[PDB]
Every structure is written in structure tokens, then in C-alpha cells.
Amino acid sequence: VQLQESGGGLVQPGGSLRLSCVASGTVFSINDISINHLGWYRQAPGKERELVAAITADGTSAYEDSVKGRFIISRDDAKKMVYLQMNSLKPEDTAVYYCNGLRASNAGWEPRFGTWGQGTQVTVSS
Amino acid sequence: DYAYTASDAAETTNVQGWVCLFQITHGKAEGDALVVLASAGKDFELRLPVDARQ
Amino acid sequence: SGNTGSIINNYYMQQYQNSMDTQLGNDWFSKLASSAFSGLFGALLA
Amino acid sequence: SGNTGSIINNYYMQQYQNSMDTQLGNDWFSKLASSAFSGLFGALLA
Amino acid sequence: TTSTGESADPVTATVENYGGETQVQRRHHTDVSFILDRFVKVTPKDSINVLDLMQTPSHTLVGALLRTATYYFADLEVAVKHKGDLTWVPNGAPVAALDNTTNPTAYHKAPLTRLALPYTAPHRVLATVYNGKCKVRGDLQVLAQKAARPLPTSFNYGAIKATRVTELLYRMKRAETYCPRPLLAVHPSAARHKQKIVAP
Amino acid sequence: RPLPTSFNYGAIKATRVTELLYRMKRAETYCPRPLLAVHPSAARHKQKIVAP
Amino acid sequence: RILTTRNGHTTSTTQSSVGITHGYATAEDFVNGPNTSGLETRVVQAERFFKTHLFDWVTSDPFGRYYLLELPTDHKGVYGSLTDSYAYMRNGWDVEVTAVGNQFNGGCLLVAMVPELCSIEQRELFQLTLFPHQFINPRTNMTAHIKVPFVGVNRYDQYKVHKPWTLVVMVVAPLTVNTEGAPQIKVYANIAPTNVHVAGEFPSKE
Amino acid sequence: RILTTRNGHTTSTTQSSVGITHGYATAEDFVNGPNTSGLETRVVQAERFFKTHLFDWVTSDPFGRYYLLELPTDHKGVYGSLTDSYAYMRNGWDVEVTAVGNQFNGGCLLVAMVPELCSIEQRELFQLTLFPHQFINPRTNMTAHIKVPFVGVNRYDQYKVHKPWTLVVMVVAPLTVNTEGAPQIKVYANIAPTNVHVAGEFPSKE
Numbered sequence A: 001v002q003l004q005e006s007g008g009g010l011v012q013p014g015g016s017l018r019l020s021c022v023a024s025g026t027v028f029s030i031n032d033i034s035i036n037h038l039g040w041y042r043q044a045p046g047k048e049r050e051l052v053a054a055i056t057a058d059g060t061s062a063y064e065d066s067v068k069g070r071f072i073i074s075r076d077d078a079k080k081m082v083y084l085q086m087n088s089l090k091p092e093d094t095a096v097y098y099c100n101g102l103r104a105s106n107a108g109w110e111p112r113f114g115t116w117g118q119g120t121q122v123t124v125s126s
Numbered sequence B: 001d002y003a004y005t006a007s008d009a010a011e012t013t014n015v016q017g018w019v020c021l022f023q024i025t026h027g028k029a030e031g032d033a034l035v036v037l038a039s040a041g042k043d044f045e046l047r048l049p050v051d052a053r054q
Numbered sequence C, D: 001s002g003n004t005g006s007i008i009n010n011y012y013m014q015q016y017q018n019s020m021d022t023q024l025g026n027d028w029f030s031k032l033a034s035s036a037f038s039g040l041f042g043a044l045l046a
Numbered sequence E: 001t002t003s004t005g006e007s008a009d010p011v012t013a014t015v016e017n018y019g020g021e022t023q024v025q026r027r028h029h030t031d032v033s034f035i036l037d038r039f040v041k042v043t044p045k046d047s048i049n050v051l052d053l054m055q056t057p058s059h060t061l062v063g064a065l066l067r068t069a070t071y072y073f074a075d076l077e078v079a080v081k082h083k084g085d086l087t088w089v090p091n092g093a094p095v096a097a098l099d100n101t102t103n104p105t106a107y108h109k110a111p112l113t114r115l116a117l118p119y120t121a122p123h124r125v126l127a128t129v130y131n132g133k134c135k136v137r138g139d140l141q142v143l144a145q146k147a148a149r150p151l152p153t154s155f156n157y158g159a160i161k162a163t164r165v166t167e168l169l170y171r172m173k174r175a176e177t178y179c180p181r182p183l184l185a186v187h188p189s190a191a192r193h194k195q196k197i198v199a200p
Numbered sequence F: 001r002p003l004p005t006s007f008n009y010g011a012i013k014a015t016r017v018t019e020l021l022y023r024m025k026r027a028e029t030y031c032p033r034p035l036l037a038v039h040p041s042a043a044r045h046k047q048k049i050v051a052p
Numbered sequence G, H: 001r002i003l004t005t006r007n008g009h010t011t012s013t014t015q016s017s018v019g020i021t022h023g024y025a026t027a028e029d030f031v032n033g034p035n036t037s038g039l040e041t042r043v044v045q046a047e048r049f050f051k052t053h054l055f056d057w058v059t060s061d062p063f064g065r066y067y068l069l070e071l072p073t074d075h076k077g078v079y080g081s082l083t084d085s086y087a088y089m090r091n092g093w094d095v096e097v098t099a100v101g102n103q104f105n106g107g108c109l110l111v112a113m114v115p116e117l118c119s120i121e122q123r124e125l126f127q128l129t130l131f132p133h134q135f136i137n138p139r140t141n142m143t144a145h146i147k148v149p150f151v152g153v154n155r156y157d158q159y160k161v162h163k164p165w166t167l168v169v170m171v172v173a174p175l176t177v178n179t180e181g182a183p184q185i186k187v188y189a190n191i192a193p194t195n196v197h198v199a200g201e202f203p204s205k206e
Helices: C029-035 D028-033 E061-067 E095-099 E138-148 G081-087 G123-130 H079-085 H123-130
Strands: A003-007 A018-021 A031-035 A040-045 A049-056 A061-063 A073-076 A081-086 A095-101 A118-125 E048-052 E067-083 E084-091 E113-117 E159-161 E164-180 E198-200 G001-009 G011-013 G050-057 G068-072 G086-099 G106-113 G135-138 G143-148 G165-176 G185-189 G194-201 H003-007 H008-015 H050-057 H066-071 H084-098 H107-111 H131-134 H143-148 H165-177 H184-189 H194-201
Touching: A003 A095, A018 A095, A018 A118, A018 H107, A049 A073, A049 A095, A061 A073, D028 E067, E048 E067, E048 H008, E061 E067, E061 E164, E061 G143, E084 E095, E084 E113, E095 E159, G081 G086, G081 G194, G086 G106, G086 G165, G086 H079, G106 G123, G106 G143, G123 G165, G135 G143, H050 H066, H050 H165, H079 H084, H079 H194, H084 H107, H107 H123, H107 H143, H123 H165, H165 H184
Parallel strands: A031 E198
Antiparallel strands: A003 A018, A018 A081, A040 A049, A040 A095, A049 A061, A073 A081, A095 A118, E048 E159, E067 E113, E067 E164, E084 E159, G001 G011, G050 G185, G068 G165, G086 G143, G086 G185, G086 G194, G106 G135, G106 G165, H003 H008, H050 H184, H066 H165, H084 H143, H084 H184, H084 H194, H107 H131, H107 H165
């Protein structure tokens, strides 16, 4: 019911990161599925936590045009895991990432749909 | 015509509503208890058996 | 009257398929649930 | 009356083969197509 | 609707108290005979198995719904997947008889073999719970009482033996149940315990 | 813009599924909608009928 | 002495009740008159209960303290929107006042429905038993019930410029606690319109 | 060819009318079902007309131009408050569309009531005559009239998450003025709910 993440800590800018989503297992209920729409959120110090990307049930992927083209996302449902690729490292990556799910409303994706997450932080400063 | 018994929510999006118990007023009844029970009705009905190992 | 739905008679005699009950000479809950009080108790206005 | 053509009764009771409909107490197009006007409209000569 | 609480008498309040309407009910799916009539898997042992209805796991559908009755009665059907030949033996018979062929023996025919057995116990009814045990040496008493509070031994439908048993499933017919008992659900940790329903 | 999730007949699962076919019985239908054919590019769109 | 009232899809039950008081009439008179041209209509979705707070009865209030409540008041349901959708209305009232303290208290209250009350004199309080009324004596009961019809010099009224009724609650003997009673008592009300009628639709909001 | 309709305390009269079209049924089916427990009720103050503006028919619009209007829309009367006071509703519709230009114009329009219209294809516009419809040809008439019942997969609906109907107006032949006709034409509508029902009251506003 609460998703764990791993692969963060203190890291130097210019490396290569693959954030991993260690889910609690997704006990999620009844056969009403194909609304499986996960995503990633970033959070700034004292500034409202902002979205980064969102994955649809099968194949569509959108990103914030700040990071558009730089990141790659994909999910593996056969084992039920989802990951986040981090290439082209900038100073803008200093934020805490939350592996969570989306709501897919008419205007825009809404948040959990959950209790809360823990998070992993990637702060890079040279 | 029918409604689900499943979906432990731990989330948003209520489907069937809420019920609310209030206390209007009271006279010198501090600390006294009100026990409450539950049971089926005249026209309750249950259908489609399943086995989720609970 | 369990979970059985064929319409053709059984092939074997009833003596071989099941065991036979004898007589000597639940089901209280269906009498108990029928005796429940439904109406209102006090005087009714409006 | 779908696509079924056997002449021997079904083996299982009707309760197990299909689901049972209940009552509360298309097909408008077959009434609508029957009410079409066929004859001629004006006075007819020849 | 007011009434006296202590009296323990049933009382039901309909929706006609505040102007509503009472509708029609169909309760075919909760009958005891219906719901208990289906196969249930059981973890088998290699050579000798004692057919006892308390070996169904308590979390399955049949297991718990059976365990909310104090006394019961039913016939039995089994479905076995084995190698060699399968021999059944009635209630209360010597264990040497598991080797003799004159007892009902089903010769192997693939894939499995389904049988129908009667009720052969000497009592008029069976029981799911029994108050017979009337209840340094720290571990001694622990493992003494733990094995001194099982059920009596004549609560079974017989035994089967084969060269190897791979599957074994039970099915009850003509079920009757007396004197209900508690039945509990999984206790949520959060505000609700939700199954992930069929949904992508 | 998909349909609601309670519009289904259930689910099936197996170690591997290779084929799956549907058949409807006692069908009833209400409130018709459009139904279109392949739009020819030329003066006619012709299937090649059984002929050597 | 149990009594159960019901208005619409709401109910209310009391166990210490001394009856209902029908004040000034037991039925309703002619609703269709020559002044509406036959355009009136009834609204049955508007007849149900709603609650409010009146005051706190402390042991230090002397005889003659009163509380006024003008009917119809600011409401938010469908009834409170009827007064925004139409120009003429008429309806009777059904009131119920409750003061809950244990049976070891002393004192007395007096509730009454007064037509067109405007600043009663001080000596006139001795004669408030001319209007439909009921007492609340903690020794015996805890509830009061009254019923009133529509009165006025006109057959339909404009509730934005005239409030024809008034619920007033007075103290005739002060409260006493005697080390076994409740230290104080809070008074609440419960009101439901009966036999509403409307005419003369308004234009939209803007 | 005069025809006069009346809903509540409002009326409407036309002199160039070719009839009424009853689409998909002529009566209403069972309103009381096992899903409301007998708590529904009718509201007759909610059945009357209201107007709106649709678009301007200019001579430069080609075949295939359409205009969509989702029912029920933002309204301010008593009907627009019903959707704020209750949780389940159901009602049928009664529509009327008018395009006024003199009889020296050319062109044609086609109005139709479509259940659950979501982005019809371009080729599917050639088959819009499967739904209840009527033409507006300035040479002959100036008004259209349609009547539809309540359709849905449920017996009562939640209008905040589902709009079961849609009024769509399409152009089949462009407008021509010919130095004797009006330079352009404005299209208006006139709609009245029929057979409303409600259940499930809400708490107050705040």
C-alpha cells in the first residue's frame, strides 16, 4: 500500500543513475485494471512538489518540458516493477523523487490514490 | 442495482457515502458509554461467491 | 437439492449412490428470524 | 431462437445453462418501418 | 423503534419507518447445501492419507464456512491423481488392510479418478470442536497440552493408500449444519482493506 | 476517454494462453449507430471473386 | 409516554411528552383565493425539520428573562431558496423545544408562539399565557410541542418585509442544581414548515 | 399549419410547422425500481422552457460543419438548483430549434438528438439520419420539434459525471441570399425538461 524506493543518497553530478521502485507489492484490488498509471514526482525545498513524468497503461509517456528528451521511463509488469533512467545530468536534478500512481482526470493527472511515499533524494552540486 | 463488497480503499474516491453519529446535548452524563451493534435487514441479499483466501 | 442440475434420472439405485437415513419414534434460526418485531413501539403522530 | 438446431431436449436444467430474466411491474423500428406511406399523393389519371 | 436491550429478543426495523419501500429478496446463494458443494484442494502425503474433513485449510472458502458449525453431516467425494492402484478402507479398520486388493481398488486410468464414498462413522453426527481435554516443565507441558487438545480419532471417513499420491480434493454432498460459531474477516490496518479488483 | 471498468464478463488466467474466441448467445441490441464500408479510390472497389 | 413525529424523510422520538398543543385552529382554511388568479402550487419537498441553538439556561437568570426568535429565519435548504425563487408564500409552523438536564433539577420554563410580537412591556409578561404555550419542568418533562396555522391580514405574504410569527421562551423560576443536578442546561429547537404554497416566479439571478 | 405548445406557465406558438418527431419511444417506462428503495419524488416546478444561442449561419460555411450542445447544461432556475440539492436524477427532453430568414433564401439544415456523441468521424456525417431528426428548409419551414425519453445503462443518473444526450446541428447545403434574402441567419433553441425525478438529499451548503 506504500511504495519504497532505492538507489539514492549522496551522489556527484555527472554519473549515471537508475532509480528503482521497490513496491510493497501492489496488493491492488479487483479485476478492474488497465488503469495502471504510475508516475514520478519531484519535490523542492519549501516549494510545492511538482510532477516529472507519468506512464500510461501500455505505452504513452510524457515529461515536464523542463526535462523533456533527457529522461527515459519504462515499466516491467511481468515482474511488476518500474524504474527511472537518469542521463544528461544537470544541476536541476536536486529533488526528492516519489514513485507513485496517477489518476488521469480530464484536465490533468491527479495524485495518489495512496497513503504517502518515503522517497529518495538526489542532490548534486559541483 | 447491485454494489461491490470489495476494494479495501486506503485511498480517495468514496463510492457509497458516509454515515455520521452526533451528540446533540446531554445532562450530567460524562464518561457514560453507548454500545452499538450491526446486523442485516429485511431485504439484504448476497450473490456471486468467490475465494480470495481470507 | 444441492448443486446438481441434470434432468435425467440417476443410473444407479438410490441404495448404492448415497447412504440411507433412518428415523426414531439449524432450522430453529429460520423460525427465530421470522418472529422479529417490525412495527413502531410508541404512539405515532404525523 | 438463435443459431441452434438440435431437436432433443437440453440435458441440463434451464437454471444452469443460462441466466434467468426478471420482470418489473430495437423493436420500435419494426413498428416504425410498418407505418410507411405507400400510395400516391395527388390525383391519378391514366 | 425503541425496545428493551437486555431482553435479547430479535427486532428489525424496516425503511417504512420514514416513508421508504421494502423490495424483493432472492437468497439462493447462501444456502448451506449449495455453497458447500464444490472441490477444495488439500496437501497430500506420499503413501497413507486419512480422510478427515478438518484438513482443509481454514482460510479457503469451504474450510472456514465449515468451521462456523459445531456439528455437521455429509457424504464425501474424492478426486485423486496417483500412480499404481488406489485402495480405500472404511472407518475403524486395521492398517494391514491397506495392502489387500479385495477392498475397493481403482486401477490406474489417466488422468485422475473420481469416487463417491458413504458416511461410515459410528456417531450420529460429527463435530468441528470438542471439549474433552477439560481445559522445569516449561516446554514439556507446552508440547503435552498442544498434542493433548486434538479431536477424537473416530472423526474420519476412512483412509486411502497408493504408491504415490500427487493431488487430493474433497467435495461434500447433502451438507447439514448445527449450532453456529464465529467467523472473522481480515482485520485492516488502515481505514480499509481493499482487494485490487480486475482493472488495468 | 475509455469506457468504465465494470463493463466486462470476468477474467481468466492460465500458465500460457494461445487462442481465445468469443461467442454471444441471446443477443439483443438497442439504439443503432453508423456502419461504414471501405471507401473506393476508383469508380468501384472490387473483391477478386472465386475465379481462375 | 412515548411520541414519534415524522415530517418527510426525517423523524424524532421523545420519551417524556405531555401531548401536542394545537393553537388557534386545528385545520387549514381556503388556500385558493381571488388574489392569485389560480397560479399557486404546493411544494412537498420543503416540509421537514431543521435545528438551531437558542440560549444557555444558567442558575443566575432572574424571572422575566426572555429570548426572541423570528420565523421564518435564515435557512439554507430548499425552503431558504423558495424565498429567492418566488414572490408570495404562505405556510404554517410546527415547533419543538428541548432542555435536557437530569430529574434532580428545579425551575420552570415557558414557551409560546406569539403573532406579531414587538417589544412586549415589562408588566405584560405576567399575562403571556394568552398565546399557545407549554411549560418545561425538569421534575416532569423535557420537551414542548406546538402547532400553529397561517394568520395575517393577507392571504399570501411577502416574507422579506413581514414576519408574522415569533417564538419566545421565558423563565418563570430560576434553575437550581442541588449538588445532584446538571450545572447548566442548553436549549435547542426543531422546526418544520407545514402546508407551503408559492406563486409568482422571479427572473433569473443575473 | 399553426401549433401551440405549453409547459407549465409558459407557451410558444409557431405558424410554419411540419409536426413533432417522437424519437425512440412515445411513453415513459417504469420509474420506481429496486435501486432507490422507494425514496424518489417528482418535481413539477422544474418543467418549463429556457433559451440559448447556438451559432450564426453565414453563407461561407461548407457542408459538414457541425455544432454540439451537451444536455443538461449550465442553468440558473430551479432545475439548475436541483442538481445541487440531490444526488440522482432522471428526465426526458423536449427541444425546439428556430432559424428565421425570409422565404427567399436557399440552403438546408439538419438537427438531431444523439445519445452519447463523442467525436463522430468525418465519413460518419453522411449517416446522421439514424437518430431522431428534422430538417429546416427556409423555402418551406422555420422550426423543428423533437421529443426523447430517458436512456441509459442505469435507471437514475449522476449528471456531474455523465451527460447522456447531445443536440447537434449540421449544414447539408450552404446559405444563399440572392439579393432578396436575409444576409445571414441566427439559430436559437428552446428546451424544457419532462418527467423529472430526484432522490438522495444532500447536506447543507457549508
